[PDB]
Design a binder for these strands. Structure first.
Ligand SMILES: [Mg+2]
Ligand SMILES: [Mg+2]
Ligand SMILES: [Mg+2]
Ligand SMILES: [Mg+2]
Ligand SMILES: [Mg+2]
Ligand SMILES: [Mg+2]
Ligand SMILES: [Mg+2]
Ligand SMILES: [Mg+2]
Ligand SMILES: [Mg+2]
Ligand SMILES: [Mg+2]
Ligand SMILES: [Mg+2]
Ligand SMILES: [Mg+2]
Ligand SMILES: [Mg+2]
Ligand SMILES: [Mg+2]
Ligand SMILES: [Mg+2]
Ligand SMILES: [Mg+2]
Ligand SMILES: [Mg+2]
Ligand SMILES: [Mg+2]
Ligand SMILES: [Mg+2]
Ligand SMILES: [Mg+2]
Ligand SMILES: [Mg+2]
Ligand SMILES: [Mg+2]
Ligand SMILES: [Mg+2]
Ligand SMILES: [Mg+2]
Ligand SMILES: [Mg+2]
Ligand SMILES: [Mg+2]
Ligand SMILES: [Mg+2]
Ligand SMILES: [Mg+2]
Ligand SMILES: [Mg+2]
Ligand SMILES: [Mg+2]
Ligand SMILES: [Mg+2]
Ligand SMILES: [Mg+2]
Ligand SMILES: [Mg+2]
Ligand SMILES: [Mg+2]
Ligand SMILES: [Mg+2]
Ligand SMILES: [Mg+2]
Ligand SMILES: [Mg+2]
Ligand SMILES: [Mg+2]
Ligand SMILES: [Mg+2]
Ligand SMILES: [Mg+2]
Ligand SMILES: [Mg+2]
Ligand SMILES: [Mg+2]
Ligand SMILES: [Mg+2]
Ligand SMILES: [Mg+2]
Ligand SMILES: [Mg+2]
Ligand SMILES: [Mg+2]
Ligand SMILES: [Mg+2]
Ligand SMILES: [Mg+2]
Ligand SMILES: [Mg+2]
Ligand SMILES: [Mg+2]
Ligand SMILES: [Mg+2]
Ligand SMILES: [Mg+2]
Ligand SMILES: [Mg+2]
Ligand SMILES: [Mg+2]
Ligand SMILES: [Mg+2]
Ligand SMILES: [Mg+2]
Lengths: 148, 185, 53, 51, 124, 228, 157
RNA sequence: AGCGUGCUACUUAUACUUCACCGUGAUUGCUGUUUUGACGCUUUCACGAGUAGGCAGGCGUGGAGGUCAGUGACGAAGCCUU
RNA sequence: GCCUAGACCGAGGACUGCGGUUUUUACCUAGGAUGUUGGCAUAAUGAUCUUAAGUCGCCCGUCUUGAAACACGGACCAAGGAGUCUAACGUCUAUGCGAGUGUUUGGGUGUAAAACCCGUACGCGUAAUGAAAGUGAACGAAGGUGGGGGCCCAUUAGGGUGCA
């Protein structure tokens, strides 16, 4: 709303809050990102280091679909078990019958190993796993089954 | 004339009321304005200040924090007090039976307190079973984990986050971030 | 001074009395009586001007 | 609501200092001193008159 | 003081606060405007210049808003507007709006006299 | 009306008991004031006797150097160098005609020496101290300037320092006592008027050269008589 | 003015005054005001008239008579601050002024027969004592005025 | 009624002292008497210069939702007026 | 210790306090002016306007270290007349939900540009780091130490537990 802006309160004061010496001018200092190497170096060096220069190799025609691999950690892995049957599975799971967790079918590419698992065997289906994630799954008596 | 040793006409710099115009938050302040004014209990004076805090000054307290706070020695049956929202944590393996008084509960949080035998009460229900805050335990959420705090106090060799819209190798990584491109700060 | 204060405090505890350990700034001097045996006051006057070159 | 000077209001003076009553009753402000009609400066203190 | 008793009414400044140079130029109206000029003799408070509004002239909170008879004046449009002054007839007075017709104004004056409300503008 | 008469009777009984208890406290402060008067007179006569004896015995009695000073800021708040400004602020002299009591030591003497071109100070007599405390004496209670109109204010703020009366406070100031700091800091700086009779023709020069600043010593009492 | 309604909490009850501790104390008259003193009236109808002071009424006023035959100034009250107390005195020990008080001068043109009788009874003794001092009756019958070069700060009365 | 110097009294700033009132900041207390206002009431103390500039609290205008079953051809708005 | 001349002021509004006198569960000068008398209400009293007198008062706005300036605009008056909207953002605040969140691209529906309803994806978040190939977050109660509000046991003190 315009009735809340300070332009309405500056009415009657000569300079409208812009100063009498400095005044409000068209473009003192330039337009946009002007002077980044000469007189705005002190700004870009302090607040945006790394701005100028080249780093790394280019990639012509990069399709981000190739690199799709959403991550799921171990502390969030049991949220993929059916909510209505989570508590029963946590009790009756054994080596003879353990829940199957299809991580790819839920939209995840790699299983990572953050957190701690319940001491309960599980069968985890993943495209990729980390070394420690699979070590923790085997320790609770589970297994990782690679899919594609 | 006076030689002033301090600045004149200085506001206290602390909130004396919520900025919110929610009438129901006013009633809780009403109740604890009376309690802090009349009980000499330090618990009620702390709560009155906490009811004034802004959204970033009352971070959510996860149900995992309550589990960890109840795991202190001799604190298993204390009353957990959260001036704010209590959120769920799907990374917990188990939750105890506990009594928790909070401004708000999420659907997952309430489902977890009652499933494990606990109670999820409001701060007015707290004031009758504990008008002096006896056997209570105030829990506050992490304030410095916010993303906005990542950019606070940014400077050379400060280790803070650049204020940037996109992230990648072409975005503020070459000169001033790398010794092969001049210097590194 | 820490050691001296500790020694004074323990000796006062041993004697069952008290000792004050805070330092004090110099205070104005007390009253006193000036004897004039051999020291009868000598009268001085400002001296006249002379040139010594 | 109004500060009253104990040096003007006698009742306030007695409120603050009850001993003022005894001071008034005993005439402590005009108390005589009992002493001898001596003059001990007859000797060497006449060094003040001349030297 | 036919109204509820009040302290003596003090008006710290009784003249109008007139805008600087509203007397020199017709385009400058007497409605007060604060001078903002760098060299202004009035903004810098030179001796001999006009008085200016400041919070020191504020009215005593016990005599504030009281007319010479000791009443606070409430604007009345229709006869139902006098109902809010039923329990305040000795501290609040009614003022009839200029746009009330000659018919309704007579009814308001008649009911106000019945209700005991005092009327500040009884002739018009 | 019934409730008012019931509470009035209860108040009357409680006030009867309170007055009975306070009578003893007033006897205590009466005895203390009488003892203070006795020791003042005895010390004065002792000093007079010592002076007379030293005069008789071809000796010279040297008075004990004053332990207390009353400092009045007679200079405005404009054009003060940073160090004397800070010194005047630390003496709580932040306005013209502000007075404060200072216990003389080396530290406080070098403080007063720094403020010397802007203040007039001296050695106050007992009657001057009494007049100051009676007419313009105020206490700092919860950071508020409260008139010393009743001995209960002094008791409530200095009873842990054995000050139960205005005369206890005056005695503690005059004969500089073990709790002089607390007693003088409880006293709000005295706000005096201008002198009746004026200053000298030009204030801001030392008292020795015909001005008003610096140490005037016992004539501070006359100056306080002009300003209080 | 505006349309600001009175509120329900705006009470109209008048509080009682606090209990005042201004207990009145008696009037202290000037040392020069002694019954029988000749006074000069400075204001009022009888301004400039020299009159005899008779009694101190309980109203803080002074009972005064001309006497009426000499001056035309009757028995009445005056205020002590509108009077110059001279040094001339008349022996009024033989004048009965017991019946004179505030209620005598109560407001009820005509004149009471009682008041005329009292005028004569008082004036008989007043004239008898006035004749003893020569020129005192003539002095009382003459009006007072300030002549050129009269300085009241230097004159004795 | 000049120059050097001493003395008595006197003159008066928005400065100082006491007091009234305005505002700001703090401060005392207020729910079995909280009693149809607690965004409210109340005790006390200190303080008040200000360009550029910041913030806060308000006044006024065209038009809009709701409400006053508001004013009005028995005269709205506008305009002139010790 | 005592007497005495004058000026200005009278905030507060049942009681509550401290003293004093105690002749007394009473009185007082002691937590802020009362008593009495006269006059006036066709008015003494107060305000404004105009004008006279006394005293002071240079033309505003602007740039400037410095303006009444022999610096610039302005003869006068009325009406108009200048920090806006948008895309994307930083801080702070309020609100809804909360490890998720966003109905409005679209579909349903309608009293039809409104209101009401629906869901897949997608954006942001939930993982970082490296130029990249790639790898990828618990020794321990998700750590120890000194503080740390609050809470618990105590009984000045002291101890326990100690979120941010
Ligand atoms: Mg506005
Ligand atoms: Mg502004
Ligand atoms: Mg400005
Ligand atoms: Mg302009
Ligand atoms: Mg700006
Ligand atoms: Mg400009
Ligand atoms: Mg600029
Ligand atoms: Mg680039
Ligand atoms: Mg000031
Ligand atoms: Mg201060
Ligand atoms: Mg941390
Ligand atoms: Mg981010
Ligand atoms: Mg670029
Ligand atoms: Mg290089
Ligand atoms: Mg005026
Ligand atoms: Mg006006
Ligand atoms: Mg006037
Ligand atoms: Mg202007
Ligand atoms: Mg200037
Ligand atoms: Mg009209
Ligand atoms: Mg009562
Ligand atoms: Mg000091
Ligand atoms: Mg004088
Ligand atoms: Mg002189
Ligand atoms: Mg001079
Ligand atoms: Mg000369
Ligand atoms: Mg002033
Ligand atoms: Mg003034
Ligand atoms: Mg209640
Ligand atoms: Mg200001
Ligand atoms: Mg300003
Ligand atoms: Mg305002
Ligand atoms: Mg509007
Ligand atoms: Mg428009
Ligand atoms: Mg509308
Ligand atoms: Mg109508
Ligand atoms: Mg005209
Ligand atoms: Mg009054
Ligand atoms: Mg007492
Ligand atoms: Mg003139
Ligand atoms: Mg002039
Ligand atoms: Mg220019
Ligand atoms: Mg320029
Ligand atoms: Mg120039
Ligand atoms: Mg100019
Ligand atoms: Mg020139
Ligand atoms: Mg120029
Ligand atoms: Mg130019
Ligand atoms: Mg033009
Ligand atoms: Mg021109
Ligand atoms: Mg012209
Ligand atoms: Mg924004
Ligand atoms: Mg997504
Ligand atoms: Mg999604
Ligand atoms: Mg290792
Ligand atoms: Mg610790």
């Amino acid at each position: 709303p315009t009735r809340l802006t300070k332009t309405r309160k500056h009415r009657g004061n000569v300079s409208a809050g812009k100063g009498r010496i400095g005044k409000h001018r068209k473009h003192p200092g330039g337009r946009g990102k002007a002077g980044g190497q000469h007189h705005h170096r002190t700004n870009l060096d302090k607040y945006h280091p790394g701005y100028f220069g080249k780093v790394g190799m280019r990639y012509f025609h990069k399709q981000q679909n190739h690199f799709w691999r959403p991550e799921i950690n171990l502390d969030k892995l049991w949220t993929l078990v059916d909510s209505e049957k989570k508590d029963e599975y946590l009790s009756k799971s054994s080596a003879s019958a353990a829940p199957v967790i299809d991580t790819l079918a839920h939209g995840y590419g790699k299983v990572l190993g953050k957190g701690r698992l319940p001491e309960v065997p599980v069968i985890v289906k993943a495209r990729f796993v980390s070394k420690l994630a699979e070590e923790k799954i085997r320790a609770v008596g589970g297994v990782v089954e690679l899919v594609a | 004339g006076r030689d002033h040793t301090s600045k004149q006409h200085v506001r206290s710099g602390h909130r004396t009321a919520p900025k919110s115009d929610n009438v129901y938050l006013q009633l809780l302040v009403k109740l604890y304005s009376f309690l802090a004014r009349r009980t000499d209990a330090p618990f009620n004076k702390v709560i009155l200040k906490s009811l004034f805090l802004s959204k970033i000054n009352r971070p959510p307290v996860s149900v995992s924090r309550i589990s960890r706070a109840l795991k202190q020695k001799g604190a298993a049956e204390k009353t957990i007090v959260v001036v704010g929202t209590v959120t769920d944590d799907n990374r917990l393996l188990e939750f105890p039976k506990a009594t928790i008084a909070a401004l708000r509960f999420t659907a997952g949080a309430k489902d977890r307190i009652l499933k494990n035998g606990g109670e999820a009460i409001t701060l007015d229900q707290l004031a009758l079973r504990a008008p002096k805050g006896q056997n209570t335990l105030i829990v506050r959420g992490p304030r410095n984990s916010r993303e906005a705090v990542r950019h606070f106090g940014f400077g050379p060799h400060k280790g803070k986050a650049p204020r940037i819209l996109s992230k990648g190798r072409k975005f503020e990584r070459a000169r001033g971030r790398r010794r092969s491109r001049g210097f590194k700060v | 001074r820490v050691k001296s204060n500790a020694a004074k405090k323990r000796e006062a505890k041993a004697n069952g009395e008290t000792v004050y350990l805070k330092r004090q700034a110099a205070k104005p001097r007390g009253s006193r009586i000036i004897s004039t045996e051999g020291n009868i006051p000598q009268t001085l006057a400002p001296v006249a001007y002379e040139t010594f070159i | 609501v109004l500060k009253k000077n104990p040096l003007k209001n006698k009742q306030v003076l007695l409120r603050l200092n009850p001993y003022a009553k005894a001071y008034a009753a005993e005439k402590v402000g005009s108390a005589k001193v009992e002493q001898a009609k001596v003059k001990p400066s007859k000797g060497q203190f006449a060094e003040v008159l001349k030297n | 003081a036919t109204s509820v008793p009040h302290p003596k009414i003090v008006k710290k400044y009784t003249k109008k606060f007139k805008r600087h140079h509203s007397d020199r130029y017709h385009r400058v109206a007497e409605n007060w405007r604060k001078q903002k000029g760098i060299d202004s003799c009035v903004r810098r408070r030179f001796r001999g210049t006009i008085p200016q509004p400041n919070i020191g002239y504020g009215s005593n909170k016990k005599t504030k808003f009281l007319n010479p008879a000791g009443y606070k004046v409430y604007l009345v449009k229709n006869v139902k507007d006098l109902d809010v002054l039923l329990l305040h007839t000795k501290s609040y007075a009614a003022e009839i709006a200029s746009s009330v017709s000659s018919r309704k104004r007579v009814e308001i004056v008649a009911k106000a006299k019945k209700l005991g409300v005092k009327v500040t503008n009884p002739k018009g | 009306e019934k409730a008012q008469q019931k509470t009035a009777e209860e108040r009357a009984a409680a006030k009867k008991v309170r007055k009975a208890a306070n009578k003893e406290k007033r006897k205590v402060i009466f005895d203390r004031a009488a003892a203070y008067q006795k020791e003042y007179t005895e010390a004065e006569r002792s000093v007079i006797k010592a002076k007379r004896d030293a005069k008789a015995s071809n000796s010279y009695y040297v008075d004990a150097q004053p332990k207390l000073v009353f400092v009045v800021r007679i200079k405005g708040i404009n054009k003060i160098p940073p160090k004397p400004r800070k010194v005047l602020q630390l003496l709580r002299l932040t306005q013209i005609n502000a007075g404060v009591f200072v216990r003389l030591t080396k530290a406080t003497s070098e403080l007063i020496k720094l403020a010397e071109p802007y203040v007039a100070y001296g050695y106050p007599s007992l009657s001057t101290i009494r007049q100051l405390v009676y007419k313009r004496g105020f206490g700092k209670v919860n950071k508020q300037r409260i008139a010393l109109s009743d001995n209960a204010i002094i008791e409530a703020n200095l009873g842990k320092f054995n000050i139960l009366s205005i005369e206890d406070l005056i005695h503690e100031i005059y004969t500089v006592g073990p709790n002089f700091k607390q007693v003088s800091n409880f006293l709000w700086p005295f706000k005096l008027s201008n002198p009746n009779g004026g200053f000298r023709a030009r204030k801001f020069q030392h008292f020795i050269q015909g001005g008003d600043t610096g140490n005037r010593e016992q004539f501070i009492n006359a100056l306080v008589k002009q300003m209080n | 003015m505006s349309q600001v309604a009175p509120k329900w909490y705006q009470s109209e009850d008048v509080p009682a005054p606090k209990q005042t501790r201004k207990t009145a104390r008696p009037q202290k008259l000037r040392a020069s005001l002694v019954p029988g003193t000749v006074l000069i009236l400075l204001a009022g109808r009888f301004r400039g008239k020299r009159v005899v002071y008779l009694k101190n009424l309980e109203d803080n006023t002074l009972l005064v008579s001309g006497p009426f035959k000499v001056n035309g100034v009757p028995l009445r009250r005056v205020n002590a601050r509108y009077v110059i107390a001279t040094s001339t005195k008349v022996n009024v020990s033989g004048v009965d002024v017991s019946k004179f008080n505030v209620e005598y001068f109560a407001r009820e043109k005509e004149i009471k027969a009682e008041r005329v009788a009292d005028q004569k009874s008082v004036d008989a003794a007043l004239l008898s004592e006035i004749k003893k001092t020569p020129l005192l009756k003539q002095y009382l019958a003459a009006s007072f005025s300030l002549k050129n070069g009269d300085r009241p700060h230097l004159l004795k009365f």
